[PDB]
Amino acid sequence: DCGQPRNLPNGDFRYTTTMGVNTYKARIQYYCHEPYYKMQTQGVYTCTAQGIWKNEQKGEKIPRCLPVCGKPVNPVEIIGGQKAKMGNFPWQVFTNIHGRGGGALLGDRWILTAAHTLYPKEHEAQSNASLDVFLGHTNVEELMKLGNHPIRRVSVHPDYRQDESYNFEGDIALLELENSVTLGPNLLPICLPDNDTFYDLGLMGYVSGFGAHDLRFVRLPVANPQACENWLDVFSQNMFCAGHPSLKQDACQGDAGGVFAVRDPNTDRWVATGIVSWGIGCSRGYGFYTKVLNYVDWIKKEME
Ligand SMILES: *[C@H]1O[C@H](CO)[C@@H](O)[C@H](O)[C@H]1NC(C)=O
Known part of the structure; x- marks a missing residue:
């Protein structure tokens, strides 16, 4: 006779055998809470003859539930500087x-x-x-x-x-x-980047921030490190420029420590590629962010 199956935070378990009998041969199944969490990929354990619950792969140790990154229940679709709606930017x-x-x-x-x-x-x-x-x-x-x-x-x-x-x-x-x-x-x-190709010219990302009452956002393209020259150029190996002479003062929509969010099309996630830094004024429509991937x-x- 084993015991009370160990707890699995952010998840639970059901018995696939007479329920409430943790005696030899019993069998349970763990399951993370849907939809915001997901098992680390089926989490089946059974009270071995010895006296402990197991799983023929990592036996004796309980699975782990994690949350689903970058994948809101309210995304959004040129360039602009408009207002934000509950859900667009959940992270x-x-x-x-x-x-x-x-x-x-x-x-x-x-x-x-x-x-x-x-x-x-x-x-x-x-x-x-x-x-x-x-x-x-x-x-x-x-x-x-x-x-x-x-x-x-x-x-x-x-x-x-x-x-x-x-x-x-x-x-x-x-x-x-x-x-x-x-x-x-x-x-x-939100998810983290892993592909060096996330910092490519023309790439379109979104920046959000307050100013100041209601959170706003902007859809700007990754610019050439030259665009951000007045702010100083080995500022390339640790950061990246972004914006467009069109945006005006809106190229600095971000707050500070805010995030530059891009949405990977091959997997339709959302990754934070940059962190609005210490800059102060988008006069020409440009600004620099720190390279997260580094x-x-x-x-x-x-x-x-
Ligand atoms: C600043 O320190 C704390 C910040 O929460 C505050 O309680 C305190 O009143 C301030 N300093 C003093 C003792 O006036």
């Missing part, structure tokens, strides 16, 4: 550390964001400063009504430098929420 995070910021949800309990966001901007005075993070809506007062999410710890890329006044490398950070969130149709994860192996090792 969107609005912060309020040292001023208004942004960030993208990763997985179940981590938020991606640019590092310079966590520190006051120079020429600004030092101060107490709670870290406020919100998600699950497009309006500001609403995101507030919902309340903020307590942060457990804060990991900032080791390359970033505070005394350096121009960080064209390592302007990325990860915040670990203290309690996972409640994945709804309005609040869901930091993927980092992101993952932090999330374990």
Whole structure:
């Protein structure tokens, strides 16, 4: 006689044998909660004669449920600078550390964001400063009504430098929420890039952000690193330019630590390819973002 099958968070299990009898020969089946989670690919265990539940492949250890990244229940389709509707950008995070910021949800309990966001901007005075993070809506007062999410710890890329006044490398950070969130149709994860070909000229992505009450967005193309010249050019190996002389002041729709979201057509997902950085004014219609892919192996090792 075995015991009470171990629990499987974000998932459960059913008995395929008389139910409630964990005696020798019993047999159960695990299943992650649909549709927001999915087993790590059928999760069948059976009380061996010895006295433990097993699975002829990884036996003795319970499967793992994960969430589905970049795949909202409300996507959207030239170029523009319009308003956002509940669902379009589900992985969107609005912060309020040292001023208004942004960030993208990763997985179940981590938020991606640019590092310079966590520190006051120079020429600004030092101060107490709670870290406020919100998600699950497009309006500001609403995101507030919902309340903020307590942060457990804060990991900032080791390359970033505070005394350096121009960080064209390592302007990325990860915040670990203290309690996972409640994945709804309005609040869901975004995927990470893996193909170097995600940073190709002309590629069309979307940027979203507040200004300032209702979250807006823009559909801009990846530009040539030359376009972003006044901001300084080895700024190519750690970042990328993007925008168009047409957009005007809307090329800077993003907030800061917000995200540059592209949608892979071969798999119709959604991947965060960049992080709006420390720039300040899209006068010509251009702006630079940090290359996320250069930091993927980092992101993952932090999330374990
Ligand atoms: C700033 O520190 C905390 C921030 O939450 C606040 O409670 C406090 O009143 C401020 N500093 C003081 C002691 O005035």
